[PDB]
Design an enzyme around this catalytic site. Structure first.
Site, short mmCIF file in Angstrom:
data_model
loop_
_atom_site.label_atom_id
_atom_site.label_comp_id
_atom_site.label_asym_id
_atom_site.label_seq_id
_atom_site.Cartn_x
_atom_site.Cartn_y
_atom_site.Cartn_z
N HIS A 1 -3.43 5.98 3.75
CA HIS A 1 -4.15 4.83 3.23
C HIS A 1 -3.57 3.53 3.77
O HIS A 1 -4.31 2.67 4.26
CB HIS A 1 -4.11 4.87 1.69
CG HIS A 1 -5.09 3.95 1.03
ND1 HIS A 1 -4.76 2.68 0.60
CD2 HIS A 1 -6.39 4.12 0.71
CE1 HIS A 1 -5.81 2.11 0.04
NE2 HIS A 1 -6.82 2.96 0.10
N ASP B 1 0.85 -1.19 0.00
CA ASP B 1 0.00 0.00 0.00
C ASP B 1 0.88 1.24 0.00
O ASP B 1 1.99 1.20 -0.54
CB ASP B 1 -0.88 0.00 1.24
CG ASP B 1 -2.20 0.72 1.03
OD1 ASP B 1 -3.25 0.04 1.03
OD2 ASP B 1 -2.18 1.97 0.86
N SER C 1 -11.17 -1.04 -0.54
CA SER C 1 -9.85 -1.15 0.05
C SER C 1 -9.93 -1.18 1.58
O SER C 1 -8.93 -1.41 2.25
CB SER C 1 -8.89 -0.04 -0.47
OG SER C 1 -9.37 1.30 -0.37
P1 LIG Z 1 -9.82 1.83 -1.77
O1 LIG Z 1 -11.30 1.60 -1.93
O2 LIG Z 1 -8.94 1.12 -2.97
C1 LIG Z 1 -9.52 0.97 -4.27
C2 LIG Z 1 -9.21 2.22 -5.10
C3 LIG Z 1 -8.95 -0.29 -4.92
O3 LIG Z 1 -9.50 3.41 -2.04
C4 LIG Z 1 -9.66 4.35 -0.97
C5 LIG Z 1 -8.69 5.51 -1.23
C6 LIG Z 1 -11.09 4.89 -0.97
#
Ligand SMILES: *P(=O)(OC(C)C)OC(C)C
Ligand SMILES: *[C@@H]1O[C@H](CO)[C@@H](O[C@@H]2O[C@H](CO)[C@@H](O[C@@H]3O[C@H](CO[C@H]4O[C@H](CO)[C@@H](O)[C@H](O)[C@@H]4O)[C@@H](O)[C@H](O)[C@@H]3O)[C@H](O)[C@H]2NC(C)=O)[C@H](O[C@@H]2O[C@@H](C)[C@@H](O)[C@@H](O)[C@@H]2O)[C@H]1NC(C)=O
EC number: 3.4.21.25
Length: 591
Positions: free
Chosen positions: A94, A30, A415
């Site tokens: 993230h 990540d 994610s």
């Molecule tokens: P996640 O849901 O990752 C997907 C884009 C695969 O993303 C966050 C930033 C909302």
């Protein structure tokens, strides 16, 4: 996360295998990890597994402990992008969020400005974490992924959580994640992967590889709402994660205050600087649309509050100003009020929470199949909590477009649910140390609880095998084992579910082969139970299987004849022996 785990029936009091759990390493690809977060505390941890080979990039203000035993970064191509930093450190937030969701330890009083108060935790508080930073403001490159995987495989990771990937489903043949995960699988390493946030259209998921456990995002009972009360005294219920205390301000419409060179035909939505900043300052702007924090700064600097609108409100997000997304009607009701007394006023409250009994329902943005690479290998594979999940956040990371003194953030996406599945899969792994990736993935699928097709009409192409069940996943009784030696007929691929592409109104007759391997010590007989719709006929031979013990295998053939007229028609097979239940969805599409 102060609530999702409990919503899944995974209490703070679940039984553990602390010894095996503490020796498991969860590799997370990540945006990096923020070591300082309470979720990654070290206290009490024994020293890292002797057979761990990873390392730590500690030449730039970063330090691994006995919780985070690995941290590396990958930007092979060109130089580091703007705003980014060299090293494993997560400046985006993230990766930190994701890691704590899967393996974060117990942190009490976890909250975002009071919102979601509770005890934050991961599925496996005792597992070690190894961070492989492959995503930048630059994006996440194919070379970094392959490289990060290589390291994870050689370092000694046990399982991999991959919360990245959303490329055009049609570019599936040039997707690197399939290359990495495949090599990972050959070394007995499973990968949890988010389906994507490109829903709800019928072919938006790019997580197509078969050995890949794909996860969709559903809701949980807890829901954030922001009450708005205009002058008359009437209230409306809008969605958003409003941390600003309750306040009262004058109201204005985007149409009433266009900006030099703008028509009220664009001012309604008050987007793209189509509003006069002068007549906007100190008031709650009312616009007929829904936009992010960026547009707030771009077009609404000066405003004290914002009221947006949308037909979709099954998830919330934070903004730079007291805001709330209202339902189209509640918006018109508010607009009238403005043209009523001429000198309006509204009060945006600090978000509160209601309980939605319809949950879990897969949320709107969750990418859905069919599998654009093979309509007979249904995807997604499963679902989990991915809406409004509160977990670890870097202190420097902004929240909703601004700075907030918080150690946790609330965000949504596939994610966010992937990490959930990752943690649960590790849990099952701690109890079944020898199972293979396909075996662990089978357990979670065959033991998942059925979801309502009345809420998500797309059936399986929305939630796959259904909603996860942590404690039942541990003892699935039987498994649809496999390995890379089997990805060398598609309907005869030992998958945990069955799929079949057909043409509208056109009688067919397909047959599928499978082999179940026993994972329970005691012998037992598993009679079969089918449940097909009307315009279909399903059978299975044998319809009764016995297993003398641990390891024994047995086969059978499922036949599906009939003819669907609609797009998606589903049925199911189940192999119960009294104690264990093994269901496998059956989907038929007219495309
Ligand atoms: P996640 O849901 O990752 C997907 C884009 C695969 O993303 C966050 C930033 C909302
Ligand atoms: C409790 O949770 C449920 C599950 O999320 C909420 O129900 C959803 O609410 C959203 C938000 O407005 C609805 O979105 C609209 O959906 C329609 C049609 O698409 C939906 O319905 C069809 C048929 O069922 C499906 O085939 C689709 O997959 C999708 O589910 C779309 O045209 C609009 O543009 C919006 O996107 C959504 O339909 C709805 N889903 C379900 C399963 O009902 C629920 O929200 C309440 O009920 C909805 C219908 C609205 O009236 C909301 O204002 C209500 O709040 C939520 N309830 C609470 C108390 O929050």
């Amino acid at each position: 996360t102060t609530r999702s785990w409990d919503f899944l029936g995974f209490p703070l009091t679940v039984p553990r295998r602390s010894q095996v759990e503490s020796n498991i390493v969860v590799g997370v690809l990540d945006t990096g990890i923020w070591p300082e977060s309470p979720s990654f505390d070290d206290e009490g941890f024994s020293p890292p597994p002797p057979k761990w080979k990873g390392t730590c990039e500690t030449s730039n203000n970063f330090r691994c402990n006995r919780k985070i035993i690995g941290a590396r970064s990958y930007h092979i191509g060109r130089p580091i992008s703007p705003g980014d930093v060299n090293g494993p450190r997560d400046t985006n937030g993230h990766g930190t969020h994701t890691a704590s969701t899967a393996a974060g330890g117990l942190v009490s009083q976890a909250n975002l400005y009071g919102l979601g108060l509770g005890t934050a935790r991961g599925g496996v508080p005792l597992a070690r974490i190894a961070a492989y930073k492959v995503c930048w403001n630059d994006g996440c490159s194919d070379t970094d992924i392959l490289a990060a995987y290589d390291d994870a495989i050689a370092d000694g990771v046990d399982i991999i959580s991959l919360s990245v990937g959303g490329a055009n489903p049609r570019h599936y043949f040039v997707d690197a994640i399939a290359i990495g995960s495949f090599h990972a699988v050959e070394r007995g390493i499973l990968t949890s992967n988010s389906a994507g946030n490109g829903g709800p259209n019928f072919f938006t998921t790019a997580s197509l590889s078969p050995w890949l456990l794909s996860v969709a995002a559903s809701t949980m009972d807890r829901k954030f709402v922001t009450q708005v009360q205009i002058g008359n005294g009437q209230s409306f219920q809008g969605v958003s994660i409003n941390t600003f205390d309750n306040q009262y301000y004058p109201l204005v419409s985007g149409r009433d205050i266009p900006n030099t060179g703008f028509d009220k035909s664009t001012s309604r939505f008050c987007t793209d600087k189509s509003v006069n900043p002068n007549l906007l300052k100190g008031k709650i702007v009312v616009c007929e649309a829904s936009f992010g924090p960026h547009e707030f700064f771009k077009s609404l600097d000066g405003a004290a509050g914002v009221l947006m609108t949308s037909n979709t409100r099954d998830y919330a997000d934070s903004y730079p100003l007291p805001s709330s997304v209202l339902d189209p009607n509640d918006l018109l009701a508010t607009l009238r009020y403005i043209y009523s007394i001429r000198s309006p006023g509204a009060t945006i409250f600090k978000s509160t929470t209601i309980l939605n009994a319809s949950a879990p329902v897969v949320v709107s943005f969750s990418s859905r199949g069919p599998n654009r690479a093979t309509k007979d290998v249904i995807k997604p594979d499963i679902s989990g909590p991915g809406v409004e999940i509160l977990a670890a956040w870097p202190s420097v990371a902004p929240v909703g477009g601004i700075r907030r003194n918080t150690l946790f953030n609330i965000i949504s996406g596939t994610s966010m649910s992937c990490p959930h599945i990752t943690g649960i899969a590790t849990y099952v792994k701690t109890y079944n140390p020898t199972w293979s990736p396909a075996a662990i993935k089978s357990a979670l699928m065959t033991t998942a609880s059925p979801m309502n097709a009345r809420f998500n009409p797309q059936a399986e192409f929305a939630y796959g095998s259904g909603h996860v069940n942590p404690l039942k996943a541990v003892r699935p009784g039987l498994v649809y084992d496999a390995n890379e030696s089997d990805y060398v007929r598609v309907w005869d691929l030992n998958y945990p579910s069955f799929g079949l592409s057909v043409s509208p109104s056109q009688t067919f007759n397909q047959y599928f082969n499978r082999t179940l391997t026993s994972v329970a010590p005691q012998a037992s007989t598993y009679r079969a139970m089918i449940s097909a719709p009307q315009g279909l006929t399903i059978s299975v031979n044998p319809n009764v299987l016995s297993f003398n013990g641990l390891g024994d295998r047995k086969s059978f053939t499922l036949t599906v004849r009939g003819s669907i007229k609609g797009f998606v028609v589903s049925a199911s097979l189940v192999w119960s022996d009294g104690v264990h239940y093994v269901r496998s969805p059956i989907t038929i599409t007219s495309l």
